[PDB]
Amino acid sequence: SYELTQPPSVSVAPGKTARITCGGNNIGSKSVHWYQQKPGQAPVLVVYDDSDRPSGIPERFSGSNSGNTATLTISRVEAGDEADYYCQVWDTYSDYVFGTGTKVTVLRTVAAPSVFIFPPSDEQLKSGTASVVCLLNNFYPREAKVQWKVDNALQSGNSQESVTEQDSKDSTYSLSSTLTLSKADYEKHKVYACEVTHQGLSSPVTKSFNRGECS
Amino acid sequence: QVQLQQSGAEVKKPGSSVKVSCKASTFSTYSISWVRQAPGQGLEWMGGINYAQKFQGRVTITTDESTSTAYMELSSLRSEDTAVYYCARDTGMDVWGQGTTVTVSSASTKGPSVFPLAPSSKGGTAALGCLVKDYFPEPVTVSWNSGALTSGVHTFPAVLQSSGLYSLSSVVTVPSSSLGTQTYICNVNHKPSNTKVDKKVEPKS
Ligand SMILES: [Cl-]
Ligand SMILES: [Cl-]
Numbered sequence: 001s002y003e004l005t006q007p008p009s010v011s012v013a014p015g016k017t018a019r020i021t022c023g024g025n026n027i028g029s030k031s032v033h034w035y036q037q038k039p040g041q042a043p044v045l046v047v048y049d050d051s052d053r054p055s056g057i058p059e060r061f062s063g064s065n066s067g068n069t070a071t072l073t074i075s076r077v078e079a080g081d082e083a084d085y086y087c088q089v090w091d092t093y094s095d096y097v098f099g100t101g102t103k104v105t106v107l108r109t110v111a112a113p114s115v116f117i118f119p120p121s122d123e124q125l126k127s128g129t130a131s132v133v134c135l136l137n138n139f140y141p142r143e144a145k146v147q148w149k150v151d152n153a154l155q156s157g158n159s160q161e162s163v164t165e166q167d168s169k170d171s172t173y174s175l176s177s178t179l180t181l182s183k184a185d186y187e188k189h190k191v192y193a194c195e196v197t198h199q200g201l202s203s204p205v206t207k208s209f210n211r212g213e214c215s
Numbered sequence: 216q217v218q219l220q221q222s223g224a225e226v227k228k229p230g231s232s233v234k235v236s237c238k239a240s241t242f243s244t245y246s247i248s249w250v251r252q253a254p255g256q257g258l259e260w261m262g263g264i265n266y267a268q269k270f271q272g273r274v275t276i277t278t279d280e281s282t283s284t285a286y287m288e289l290s291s292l293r294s295e296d297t298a299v300y301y302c303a304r305d306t307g308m309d310v311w312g313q314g315t316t317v318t319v320s321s322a323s324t325k326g327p328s329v330f331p332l333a334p335s336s337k338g339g340t341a342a343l344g345c346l347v348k349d350y351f352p353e354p355v356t357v358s359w360n361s362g363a364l365t366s367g368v369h370t371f372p373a374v375l376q377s378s379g380l381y382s383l384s385s386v387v388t389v390p391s392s393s394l395g396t397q398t399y400i401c402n403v404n405h406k407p408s409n410t411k412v413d414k415k416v417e418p419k420s
Binding site for chain 2: 031033035037042043044045048049054086088090095096097098099100101114116117118120121123124127129131133135137138160161162163164174176178180214215
């Protein structure tokens with residue numbers, strides 16, 4: 001078969017120029033197509049046959065392709081161009097092949113997350129479950145580790161998390177981590193602790209409560 | 216001005232098969248390709264009327280010139296088939312359908328429970344929210360104070376739990392002095408179960 005390689009993400013300052021590469025063997029001999037996908041929308045063809053844009057696609061988007069690398073260039077990146085970008089080719093033997101996609105990230109200064117811990121509500125506890133929530137608010141860049149601790153036991157596999165997209169005003173992320181425990185297990189331990197590591201904190205920040213004390 | 220209109224969203228049991236349709240607005244000159252995207256994953260070519268050997272067998276792709284409609288049947292569905300299914304016209308692919316959500320699950324329709332995430336008892340800014348927990352299928356909408364409160368709101372993307380049910384949190388940052396004076400209400404809608412809830416979120420004693 002035939003494979004297309006792309007970097008996971010590119011970071012560019014507003015007004016500055018983003019370059020997204022698409023690796024492939026003799027990709028120089030193929031017509032490379034580029035698709036922009038904003039979140040919860042269909043992909044949009046921005047660059048076809050290496051360097052051609054359709055009507056209504058800004059001047060800012062241009063393409064280039066030779067040897068084993070083709071390049072989508074996005075000049076004067078505004079917040080609006082935060083998207084996934086997919087290269088794609090028609091192989092004689094593999095039909096249509098997509099690259100893995102590159103996320104375009106707007107670059108801003110480092111911001112430390114503000115950290116909040118929420119105990120299970122009394123309402124949830126009555127219904128036989130406990131969710132403990134850890135909120136990391138308005139941080140940059142995206143990379144963050146949350147380690148959960150219960151009576152100093154490090155929690156592994158029993159948590160899930162999701163991240164918003166870059167805010168279009170301040171360019172930050174927020175992340176929520178939910179620790180799931182049975183009500184019987186929540187009531188066996190006292191100290192519930194969320195530990196946050198990020199480039200913006202010189203040492204990691206712990207938010208804790210003790211079960212059934214004003215938190 | 217060709218446009219491709221896809222058939223509605225579908226919840227499918229493991230083992231079953233789904234037929235997705237794609238109606239054009241002279242489609243006898245172009246080829247239609249089917250492309251899928253699992254949630255958070257890349258675009259992946261399926262086939263056109265030619266099958267990707269990852270799906271040779273399980274996929275059936277047909278066209279009816281008479282009604283300029285393209286069809287895609289995917290059989291013996293697994294969770295891993297959960298995806299948006301797009302149709303596109305080949306040139307490159309220039310015209311895209313809006314996409315068909317296929318959710319492969321054993322779960323039954325269920326409205327969420329809405330739990331408060333009460334603002335910490337201990338100037339500056341306090342965080343508070345709603346946990347919207349154990350619903351099927353997607354989506355739910357959340358707003359704050361019937362749309363009056365948008366500043367500092369974050370509604371996280373839903374997460375599928377091991378139980379096969381979704382949950383999500385909505386949070387807002389507010390001034391600490393507004394606690395007990397300002398009423399903070401999250402508005403939760405889950406249309407598939409006809410569950411509507413306005414939940415008051417309040418400091419614990
Ligand atoms: Cl910085
Ligand atoms: Cl769990």
